[PDB]
Design an enzyme around this catalytic site. Structure first.
Site, PDB file in Angstrom:
ATOM      1  N   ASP A   1      18.951  76.411  33.396  1.00 49.86           N
ATOM      2  CA  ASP A   1      19.478  76.220  33.907  1.00 49.86           C
ATOM      3  C   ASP A   1      20.363  74.985  34.265  1.00 49.86           C
ATOM      4  O   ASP A   1      19.939  73.734  33.305  1.00 49.86           O
ATOM      5  CB  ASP A   1      19.754  76.416  34.861  1.00 49.86           C
TER       6      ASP A   1
ATOM      7  N   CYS B   1      24.328  85.909  34.702  1.00 47.06           N
ATOM      8  CA  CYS B   1      23.358  84.200  34.939  1.00 47.06           C
ATOM      9  C   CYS B   1      22.910  83.810  35.640  1.00 47.06           C
ATOM     10  O   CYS B   1      22.518  82.430  35.985  1.00 47.06           O
ATOM     11  CB  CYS B   1      24.003  83.028  33.765  1.00 47.06           C
TER      12      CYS B   1
ATOM     13  N   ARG C   1      27.189  79.942  33.717  1.00 47.14           N
ATOM     14  CA  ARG C   1      26.811  80.632  32.861  1.00 47.14           C
ATOM     15  C   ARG C   1      27.619  80.981  31.435  1.00 47.14           C
ATOM     16  O   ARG C   1      28.041  81.039  31.176  1.00 47.14           O
ATOM     17  CB  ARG C   1      25.321  80.515  32.344  1.00 47.14           C
ATOM     18  N   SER C   2      27.772  82.455  32.737  1.00 49.77           N
ATOM     19  CA  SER C   2      28.903  83.844  31.860  1.00 49.77           C
ATOM     20  C   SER C   2      29.871  83.202  31.902  1.00 49.77           C
ATOM     21  O   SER C   2      30.638  84.558  30.286  1.00 49.77           O
ATOM     22  CB  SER C   2      28.486  84.584  32.987  1.00 49.77           C
TER      23      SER C   2
ATOM     24  N   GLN D   1      31.976  74.683  36.129  1.00 46.62           N
ATOM     25  CA  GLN D   1      31.125  73.419  37.030  1.00 46.62           C
ATOM     26  C   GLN D   1      31.412  71.928  36.205  1.00 46.62           C
ATOM     27  O   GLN D   1      30.627  70.950  36.848  1.00 46.62           O
ATOM     28  CB  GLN D   1      29.363  73.885  37.753  1.00 46.62           C
TER      29      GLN D   1
HETATM   30  C1  LIG Z   1      39.107  75.283  50.823  1.00 53.25           C
HETATM   31  N1  LIG Z   1      39.883  73.807  50.960  1.00 53.25           N
HETATM   32  C2  LIG Z   1      40.102  73.562  51.911  1.00 53.25           C
HETATM   33  O1  LIG Z   1      39.688  73.733  53.356  1.00 53.25           O
HETATM   34  N2  LIG Z   1      41.801  72.740  52.826  1.00 53.25           N
HETATM   35  C3  LIG Z   1      42.084  72.645  54.200  1.00 53.25           C
HETATM   36  C4  LIG Z   1      41.581  70.446  53.300  1.00 53.25           C
HETATM   37  C5  LIG Z   1      42.442  69.942  54.984  1.00 53.25           C
HETATM   38  C6  LIG Z   1      41.377  70.385  56.068  1.00 53.25           C
HETATM   39  O2  LIG Z   1      41.320  69.428  56.991  1.00 53.25           O
HETATM   40  N3  LIG Z   1      41.064  72.184  56.452  1.00 53.25           N
HETATM   41  C7  LIG Z   1      41.505  73.213  54.907  1.00 53.25           C
HETATM   42  O3  LIG Z   1      41.719  74.436  55.393  1.00 53.25           O
HETATM   43  C8  LIG Z   1      42.049  72.688  51.100  1.00 53.25           C
HETATM   44  C9  LIG Z   1      43.161  71.827  51.025  1.00 53.25           C
HETATM   45  C10 LIG Z   1      43.547  71.780  49.450  1.00 53.25           C
HETATM   46  C11 LIG Z   1      42.596  72.656  48.490  1.00 53.25           C
HETATM   47  C12 LIG Z   1      42.452  72.589  46.896  1.00 53.25           C
HETATM   48  C13 LIG Z   1      41.318  72.343  46.351  1.00 53.25           C
HETATM   49  C14 LIG Z   1      41.147  72.309  44.877  1.00 53.25           C
HETATM   50  N4  LIG Z   1      41.388  73.579  45.074  1.00 53.25           N
HETATM   51  C15 LIG Z   1      40.175  74.343  44.447  1.00 53.25           C
HETATM   52  O4  LIG Z   1      38.899  74.491  44.762  1.00 53.25           O
HETATM   53  N5  LIG Z   1      40.872  75.986  44.105  1.00 53.25           N
HETATM   54  C16 LIG Z   1      39.458  77.056  44.064  1.00 53.25           C
HETATM   55  C17 LIG Z   1      40.224  77.852  43.446  1.00 53.25           C
HETATM   56  C18 LIG Z   1      40.012  79.141  43.234  1.00 53.25           C
HETATM   57  C19 LIG Z   1      38.251  79.510  43.524  1.00 53.25           C
HETATM   58  C20 LIG Z   1      37.670  78.115  44.205  1.00 53.25           C
HETATM   59  C21 LIG Z   1      36.328  77.990  44.710  1.00 53.25           C
HETATM   60  S1  LIG Z   1      35.444  77.875  43.412  1.00 53.25           S
HETATM   61  O5  LIG Z   1      36.221  76.134  42.645  1.00 53.25           O
HETATM   62  O6  LIG Z   1      35.160  78.716  42.090  1.00 53.25           O
HETATM   63  N6  LIG Z   1      34.224  76.949  43.416  1.00 53.25           N
HETATM   64  C22 LIG Z   1      33.092  75.956  43.762  1.00 53.25           C
HETATM   65  C23 LIG Z   1      31.611  75.099  43.087  1.00 53.25           C
HETATM   66  C24 LIG Z   1      31.271  75.993  43.885  1.00 53.25           C
HETATM   67  N7  LIG Z   1      29.578  76.094  42.692  1.00 53.25           N
HETATM   68  C25 LIG Z   1      28.218  76.477  43.401  1.00 53.25           C
HETATM   69  C26 LIG Z   1      28.435  76.881  44.583  1.00 53.25           C
HETATM   70  C27 LIG Z   1      26.606  77.582  45.232  1.00 53.25           C
HETATM   71  C28 LIG Z   1      26.107  77.964  44.255  1.00 53.25           C
HETATM   72  C29 LIG Z   1      26.095  77.385  43.337  1.00 53.25           C
HETATM   73  C30 LIG Z   1      25.050  77.499  42.380  1.00 53.25           C
HETATM   74  S2  LIG Z   1      23.490  77.651  41.995  1.00 53.25           S
HETATM   75  C31 LIG Z   1      22.987  78.149  40.668  1.00 53.25           C
HETATM   76  C32 LIG Z   1      21.023  77.699  40.489  1.00 53.25           C
HETATM   77  O7  LIG Z   1      20.916  76.507  39.274  1.00 53.25           O
HETATM   78  O8  LIG Z   1      20.457  78.705  40.815  1.00 53.25           O
HETATM   79  C33 LIG Z   1      24.106  77.607  39.782  1.00 53.25           C
HETATM   80  O9  LIG Z   1      23.740  78.304  38.534  1.00 53.25           O
HETATM   81  C34 LIG Z   1      24.139  77.194  37.727  1.00 53.25           C
HETATM   82  C35 LIG Z   1      24.392  77.696  36.396  1.00 53.25           C
HETATM   83  O10 LIG Z   1      24.318  79.092  35.930  1.00 53.25           O
HETATM   84  O11 LIG Z   1      25.378  76.942  36.270  1.00 53.25           O
HETATM   85  C36 LIG Z   1      25.105  77.729  40.199  1.00 53.25           C
HETATM   86 CL1  LIG Z   1      26.538  78.011  39.816  1.00 53.25          CL
HETATM   87  C37 LIG Z   1      27.232  76.768  42.369  1.00 53.25           C
HETATM   88  C38 LIG Z   1      31.177  77.582  43.013  1.00 53.25           C
HETATM   89  C39 LIG Z   1      32.524  77.819  44.459  1.00 53.25           C
HETATM   90  C40 LIG Z   1      31.961  77.839  45.892  1.00 53.25           C
HETATM   91  C41 LIG Z   1      33.281  79.302  43.875  1.00 53.25           C
HETATM   92  C42 LIG Z   1      38.572  77.140  44.217  1.00 53.25           C
HETATM   93  C43 LIG Z   1      42.565  73.952  44.702  1.00 53.25           C
HETATM   94  C44 LIG Z   1      43.666  73.393  46.241  1.00 53.25           C
HETATM   95  C45 LIG Z   1      41.303  72.863  49.263  1.00 53.25           C
HETATM   96  C46 LIG Z   1      40.927  73.398  49.874  1.00 53.25           C
END
Ligand SMILES: Cn1c(=O)n([C@@H]2CCC(=O)NC2=O)c2ccc(C3CCN(C(=O)Nc4cccc(CS(=O)(=O)N5CC[C@H](Nc6cccc(-c7sc(C(=O)O)c(OCC(=O)O)c7Cl)c6)CC5(C)C)c4)CC3)cc21
Ligand SMILES: [Zn+2]
Lengths: 386, 831, 277
Positions: free
Chosen positions: C182, C216, C222-223, C260
């Protein structure tokens, strides 16, 4: 903690893309109790109340077609108050008119940065699903009922010349000016001796007295708030205070259903006096913050509506200290929001869910210093607080 | 649905204004008194007042004036009602028949406009070229008089000054000129204008707009001599005329606020001033001359003429005698004297007229013979005010209803009756002025002080901190008492006094639990000026025996108990948006059983067996049911239509009567048995009726006699209501057939009868408020039906043309003046 | 003759821009409603409360009342081969996965991590090593293994999933990339190339049966890289060269199948270059 710095005007400006807004200030008025067909903008789940300013970002092609259709039209669109999110469970809403619009069409996709403002409330009559691109609903506008002074009925005609009194001596510089309120009651409500109720009871229903009571607590929340910012009219004052109330949806729709301004002021005062602790939405055994830590950082009040760059609106609440909260992210400014304050995701220890952000001034010499940005949806006030 | 009949059992007795003129004839001096909706014309005889007429016109009297337009003799009257129904009246006499003819009339309402908080002003030009009405903010309506404007067509002149205190016309001007004081952030300023009908607008004023005392309220126009005007404020009296400005600040009038005035002589040398507290002064003009065209005043002087009732209007009629038209108390006819009476008072009273006044509470109590239930009312306020006993007929005095006065010299607020002790539990409150460091002092010998026994409450509760700092030298603080008054002699037997700054809200008499003794339950609230919403109160209970009272129980409540009733075997109280049911234990102590919260301040609380009606001040009315098998209250139905509201009552298990803003009456009916739950959970409003009086209290019972016809009586049930102007009306329920017949009678009577001012009765009785104006439904104007018999026989024949209906309501048999007369004379017995 | 992709790869290695490249590609990424996938009453059935499948991309093929699935479907017209993305199989979500693959006419199953990655449970095991037929009464499902089928670098766990109430069967070549921990990547891209060639020659990359499901236990870390290398191989090897980042953004519109860490991007580029010709 009460040191005053940075100007509250900036958060209200919504500095998200700069300037050059539509800024028509033309407004629109609709006949009350009438029945109007009005387009309902979807995926905007939130309770909007009149006077509140709502920013919006649109990505759906149907929604941008809706935006254009409004931009040629009178551009007033409905925002339903979904009692239950199940499908809609909608009975009342609030029309909102556009006052700030720009279009950029970044990349090959289209983006809308429309900012609107609520104007009037209504009761939904026929939701329907015509124009499958965008739902139009036929709704009945709720009229704004204004009541005359409760002492106008008894009408002591001789005493009528004494109903006009000198203004407040000074806004707040003099404490003896509190005796003016003690003298205001004795003069305006003298004719209460002809009724079966005491003078102080009628003061519990006067708009001016209720407005002053709220204003006193608002200035308790914000020593820098001062006068000349709140509206003079009871109707607008009641709506403005309703915007800055950290309550849930059921209380919010209860406030919206209330028609008379005096009723709104009374219930706003009661909530503002009772609810003094906010817990997590699911785990009520959290008690994130009490009433004594609320402070306003914008002219709209301690509470405001903002939208992340994803179309999701967040009714943030500025607060000094938040307990049982652990930071998740890192202090990156990224999006403007509060100018130069950065943001870190926050969560409650008991419940693994989002609660709000943490803003820390990047210049190290700003009075607001470090505060919390909790959201309405993640917080659940408790009436007894016991 | 909900067919109801409302009849005035006692005409209003509170005066709004009275004028001295020559209405009846050019050689007679007439006094016109406006008791709300009743105009009465009396003739002065130098030994009293001789009534000459009384007219019950269709509406209130917002303003009334007399003027002689020089076009004819015998003077003319102008009347404007609360509904903006202006009219011009002439006293046309024909040998023996006296008539009030209408020269012209017209509705003078504006389509869109917010009524000014100051109120209606009705000035008349001294040359009678125009009349000026101040009805709305920033506007000034004008009605010319040239024999052409028979429709009372008025035009509005825009006014820059919004907040206007008082306006008047100026004597001795070639063109109509007005003067008025107004308020701006700079202060109060006295401006003037020259209104001209040629350009239909204003002009420049004769003089400037100098500043006046911040409490300037009165504007007086002296006649052609001296010119100019006089501005009266809280503590300063000024006279302005062009360049001349002469101001004095006498200390005598500093005590109170001058609220009444008028001329004394046609030359304007003397003026009568009445103040807020009832004192009467006389203001003098020196009439100083230096040459031709004196138009000067040496100085102004006032003198305390004496003490009368709280004046609402004053007219110097004939000589020496002045009619003080009190409204809180009873109107007098005191006589001025040039010399003091060895007491510093130049005034001596010689006649007083009854005035039930406020009627803040009522009690229908059956005294001596059963069935003939008299009424006891708590009239008046402050030094005025008394227990008024009203008895219908005599089984000696010769009057339809006899009124007995028991002065208290303090304001009563609530009243209850006790059969066992044969006593009256009257709540009351007096005003005391704080000393330099003492515990306040009285101002008059009041009922709560001049009593046989004067026990005071000495409860140990409420020992928390408070800051009376605000208690400066002059601070009128209210001291509340419960007075036990004998039924027979009406002498105050006991004068129990409550705690300091404690407000006795509610009072009742009952017999709780299985205990045989009956108690006076008094619910009081601890009030402090710092605390906007009271947080502490107490429910005390008293037992009266052997000429003494004893607190046998006192329950802390942590609220402000507003009203308590005797639920069968229990005590139903309302504290703060909570309705609590207290049980009377065998240990003589109240024990709470169940409390239900209804999110609205439960001001009004009534019971109809197991149903409980709860009403907020702002029209919020809901129903509750106490389920005995469990012991909790379930909400049956509610109704939220935000509007001001003063009293409630339960006509029967389905209909609920109440008052509403703009002197209206409403009846909400619980339809029940509906198809939908949410539909049957909402009370359907049925009856609306513009009564024209501010209903203050409701009380079940009748003043006539007990059940005479048993079930043969068409009217089911009967309640009485007491108002502020003094009317005591009666409301009953009717049947559908009788309702339809009486409504047809009402329509035909309106068709045939002629009102005063040519005002439509349907418009007058229409439910009026700011939201809308719906026509009256579900109510029968009993005054019209009773007046039906007061017209000539040809009118009766004209009003029964093709009625059918008539006897037994059967086979639509044709009508005649034998059963219609019969039904009318039977209806006139219920009251 | 090398293409511009190798030159860009060497440039990125030289200037150390992989981390800024991933940061900017995440900043320019765009989200989609996915509001229905998250409910207050649905958090129990959500394996990870962070991620959420987009409503338009996800297909609620449930043919029943409620019965939420934390799944999604991706369909890019350039490759013409739809894929299914899922999460860790909670028992309720496990039955959901059973009915999902039963209704989708699936032909293969790809598992890319162990049950005991980082000596802890991340995905719930549902396939026996031996036959060990098991009947689940939640939806009348039958589970049986065709063979052990152990390979050098991975394993095949082909199942014979049969519905008794419906009365039918379906054999799926349930692959299982054993040699993968992983949050990491295998050192040798040759093993990845051999495994993906075996998968693509197994009929999964054809419109013969329903779209294959790749998971995955999270379907993101991974997928996503495997799906993007597959679509690049079936996209730019068949004709004109296509830039990786644009099509990566396009498929990212379907789901947040990010990596990631730019190390996965480097591995993806290496595998694509190795699979060129
Ligand atoms: C959100 N936002 C705000 O709120 N504001 C304001 C701020 C100001 C304030 O004050 N207020 C607000 O409101 C923002 C202001 C600017 C902005 C910019 C900021 C940057 N930006 C983006 O980000 N755009 C974006 C586009 C599409 C999608 C996404 C979601 S995402 O990027 O894709 N993503 C992140 C990483 C997570 N990682 C994770 C999570 C959980 C579990 C595991 C495990 S656990 C595990 C095991 O081992 O069991 C695993 O497996 C391992 C393996 O297999 O590899 C694995 Cl994986 C892994 C997954 C997850 C959640 C899906 C993002 C562009 C705009 C964003 C604001
Ligand atoms: Zn939580």
């Amino acid at each position: 903690p009460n040191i005053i710095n940075f100007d509250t005007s900036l958060p209200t400006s919504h500095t998200y893309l700069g300037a050059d807004m539509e800024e028509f200030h033309g407004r629109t008025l609709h006949d009350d109790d009438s029945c109007q067909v009005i387009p309902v903008l979807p995926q905007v789940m939130m309770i909007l109340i009149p006077g509140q300013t709502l920013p919006l970002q649109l990505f759906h092609p149907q929604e941008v077609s809706m935006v254009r259709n409004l931009i040629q039209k009178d551009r007033t669109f409905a925002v339903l108050a979904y009692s239950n999110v199940q499908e809609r469970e909608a009975q009342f809403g609030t029309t909102a008119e556009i006052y700030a619009y720009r279009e950029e069409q970044d990349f090959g996709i289209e983006i809308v940065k429309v900012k609107a403002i609520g104007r009037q409330r209504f009761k939904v009559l026929e939701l329907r699903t015509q124009s499958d691109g965008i739902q139009q609903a036929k709704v009945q506008i709720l009229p704004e009922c204004v009541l005359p002074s409760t002492m106008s009925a008894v009408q002591l005609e001789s005493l009528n010349k004494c109903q006009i009194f000198p203004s407040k001596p000074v806004s707040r510089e003099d404490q003896c000016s509190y005796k003016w309120w003690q003298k205001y009651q004795k003069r305006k409500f003298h004719c209460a001796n002809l009724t079966s109720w005491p003078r102080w009871l009628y003061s519990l229903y006067d708009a001016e007295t209720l407005m002053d009571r709220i204003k006193k607590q608002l200035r308790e929340w914000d020593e820098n708030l001062k006068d000349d910012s709140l509206p003079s009219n009871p109707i607008d004052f009641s709506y403005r205070v309703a915007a800055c109330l950290p309550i849930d949806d059921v209380l919010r729709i209860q406030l919206l259903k209330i028609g008379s301004a005096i009723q709104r002021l009374r219930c706003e005062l009661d909530i503002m006096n009772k609810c003094t602790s906010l817990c997590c939405k699911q785990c009520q055994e959290t008690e994130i913050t009490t009433k004594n830590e609320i402070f306003s950082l914008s002219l709209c009040g301690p509470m405001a509506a903002y939208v992340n760059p994803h179309g999701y609106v967040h009714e943030t609440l500025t607060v000094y200290k938040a307990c049982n909260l652990n930071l998740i992210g890192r202090p990156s400014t990224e999006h403007s929001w509060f100018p130069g304050y950065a943001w870190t995701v926050a969560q409650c220890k008991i419940c693994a869910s989002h609660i709000g952000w943490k803003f820390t001034a990047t210049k190290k010499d700003m009075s607001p210093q470090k505060f919390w940005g909790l959201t309405r949806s993640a917080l659940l006030p408790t009436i007894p607080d016991t | 649905m909900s067919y109801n009949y409302v009849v005035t059992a006692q005409k209003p007795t509170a005066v709004n204004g009275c004028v001295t003129g020559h209405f009846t004839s050019a050689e007679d001096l007439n006094l016109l008194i406006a008791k709300n909706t009743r105009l009465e014309i009396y003739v002065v005889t130098a030994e009293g007042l001789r009534p000459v007429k009384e007219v019950g016109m269709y509406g209130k009297i917002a303003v009334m004036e007399l003027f002689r337009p020089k076009g004819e003799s015998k003077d003319l009257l102008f009347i404007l009602t609360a509904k903006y129904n202006a009219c011009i009246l002439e006293y046309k006499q024909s040998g023996e028949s006296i008539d009030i003819i209408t020269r012209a009339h017209g509705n003078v309402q504006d389509r869109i406009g917010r009524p000014s908080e100051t109120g209606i002003i009705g000035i008349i030009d001294p040359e009678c070229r125009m009349i000026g009405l101040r009805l709305y903010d920033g506007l000034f309506k004008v009605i010319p008089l040239d024999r052409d404007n028979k429709e009372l067509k008025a035009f509005n002149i825009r006014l820059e000054e919004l907040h206007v205190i008082d306006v008047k016309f100026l004597y001795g001007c070639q063109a109509p000129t007005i003067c008025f004081v107004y308020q701006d952030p700079q202060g109060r300023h006295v401006k003037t204008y020259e209104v001209s009908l040629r350009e239909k607008e204003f002009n420049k004023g004769p003089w400037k707009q100098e500043n006046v005392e911040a409490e300037a309220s009165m504007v007086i126009a002296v006649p052609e001599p001296f010119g100019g005007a006089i501005i009266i404020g809280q503590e300063s009296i000024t006279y302005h005329n062009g360049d001349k400005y002469l101001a004095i600040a006498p200390p005598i009038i500093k005590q109170s606020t001058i609220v009444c005035h008028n001329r004394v002589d046609p030359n304007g040398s003397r003026y009568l001033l009445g103040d807020m507290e009832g004192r009467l002064f006389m203001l003098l003009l020196e009439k100083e001359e230096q040459m031709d065209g004196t138009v000067t005043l040496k100085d102004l002087r006032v003198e305390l003429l004496g003490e009368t009732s709280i004046a609402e209007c004053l007219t110097y009629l004939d000589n020496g005698v002045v009619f003080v038209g009190s409204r809180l108390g009873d109107s007098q006819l005191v006589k001025l004297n040039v010399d003091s009476n060895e007491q510093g008072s130049y005034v001596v009273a010689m006649e007083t007229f009854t005035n039930l006044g406020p009627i803040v509470d009522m009690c229908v109590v059956d005294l001596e013979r059963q069935g003939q239930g008299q009424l006891v009312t708590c009239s008046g306020a402050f030094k005025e005010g008394s227990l008024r006993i009203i008895r219908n007929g005599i089984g000696d005095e010769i009057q339809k209803l006899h009124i007995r006065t028991v002065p208290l010299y303090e304001s009563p607020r609530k009243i209850c009756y006790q059969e066992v002790s044969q006593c009256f539990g009257v709540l009351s409150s007096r005003i005391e002025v704080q000393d330099t460091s003492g515990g306040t002092t009285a101002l008059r010998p009041s009922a709560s002080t001049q009593a046989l026994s004067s026990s005071v409450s000495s409860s140990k509760l409420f020992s928390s901190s408070t800051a009376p700092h605000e208690t400066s030298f002059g601070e009128e603080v209210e001291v509340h008492n419960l007075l036990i008054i004998d039924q027979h002699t009406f002498e105050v037997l006991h004068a129990h006094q409550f705690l300091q700054n404690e407000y006795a809200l509610s009072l009742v008499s009952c017999k709780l639990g299985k205990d045989p003794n009956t108690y006076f339950i008094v619910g009081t609230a601890m009030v402090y000026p710092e605390e906007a919403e009271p947080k502490q109160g107490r429910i005390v209970v008293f037992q009266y025996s052997d000429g003494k009272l004893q607190t046998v129980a006192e329950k802390e409540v942590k609220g402000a108990v507003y009203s308590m009733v005797e639920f069968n075997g229990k005590l139903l109280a309302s504290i703060n948006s909570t309705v609590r049911l207290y049980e009377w234990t065998t240990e003589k102590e109240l024990r709470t059983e169940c409390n239900h919260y209804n999110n609205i301040m439960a001001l009004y609380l009534k019971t109809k067996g197991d149903f409980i009606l709860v009403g907020d001040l702002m029209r919020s009315v809901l129903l509750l049911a106490y389920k005995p098998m469990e012991g909790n209250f379930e909400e049956i139905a509610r109704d939220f239509n935000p509007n001001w509201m003063s009293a409630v009552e339960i006509l029967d298990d389905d209909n609920f009567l109440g008052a509403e803003n703009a002197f209206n009456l409403f009846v909400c009916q619980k339809d029940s048995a509906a198809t939908t739950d949410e539909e049957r959970q909402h009370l359907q409003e049925v009856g609306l009726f513009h009564l024209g009086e501010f209903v203050n209290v409701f009380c079940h019972g009748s003043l006539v006699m007990q059940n005479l016809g048993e079930t043969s009586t068409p009217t089911q049930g009967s309640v009485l209501f007491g108002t502020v102007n003094g009317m005591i009306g009666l409301v009953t329920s009717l049947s559908e057939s009788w309702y339809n017949l009486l409504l047809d009678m009402q329509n035909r009577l309106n068709k045939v009868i002629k009102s005063v001012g040519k005002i439509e009765h349907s418009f007058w009785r229409s439910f009026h408020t700011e939201r809308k104006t719906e026509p009256a439904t579900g109510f029968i104007d009993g005054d019209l039906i009773e007046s039906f018999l007061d017209i000539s026989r040809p009118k009766m024949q004209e009003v029964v043309a093709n009625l059918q209906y008539d006897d037994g309501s059967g086979m639509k048999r044709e009508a005649t003046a034998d059963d219609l007369i019969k039904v009318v004379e039977e209806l006139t017995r219920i009251h | 003759m090398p293409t511009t992709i190798e030159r860009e790869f060497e440039e990125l290695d030289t200037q150390r821009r992989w981390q800024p490249l991933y940061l900017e590609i995440r900043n320019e990424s765009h989200d989609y409603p996915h509001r229905v996938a998250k409910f207050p009453e649905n958090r129990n059935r959500n394996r990870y409360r962070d991620v959420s499948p987009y409503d338009h991309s996800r297909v609620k093929l449930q043919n029943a009342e409620n019965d939420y699935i934390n799944a999604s479907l991706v369909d890019i017209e350039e490759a013409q081969r739809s894929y299914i993305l899922t999460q860790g199989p909670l028992p309720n979500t496990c039955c959901h996965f059973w009915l999902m693959v039963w209704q989708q006419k699936t032909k293969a199953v790809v598992m890319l991590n162990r049950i005991v990655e980082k000596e802890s449970v991340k995905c719930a095991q549902y396939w026996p090593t031996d036959d060990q037929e098991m009947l689940f009464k939640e939806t009348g499902f039958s589970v049986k293994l065709l063979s052990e089928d152990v390979k050098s670098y991975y394993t095949v766990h082909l199942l014979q999933l049969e519905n008794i109430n419906s009365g039918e069967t379906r054999t799926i070549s349930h692959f299982h990339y054993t040699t993968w921990p992983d949050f990491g990547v295998p050192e040798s891209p040759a093993s990845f190339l051999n495994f993906l060639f075996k998968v693509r020659e197994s009929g999964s990359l054809n419109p013969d049966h329903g779209p294959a499901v790749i998971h995955c236990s999270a379907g993101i870390g991974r997928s996503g890289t495997f799906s993007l290398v597959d679509t690049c191989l079936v996209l730019m090897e068949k004709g004109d060269d296509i830039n990786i980042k644009q099509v990566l953004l396009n498929m990212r519109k379907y789901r947040m199948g990010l990596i990631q860490t730019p190390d996965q991007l480097r591995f993806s580029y290496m595998a694509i270059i190795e699979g060129a010709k």
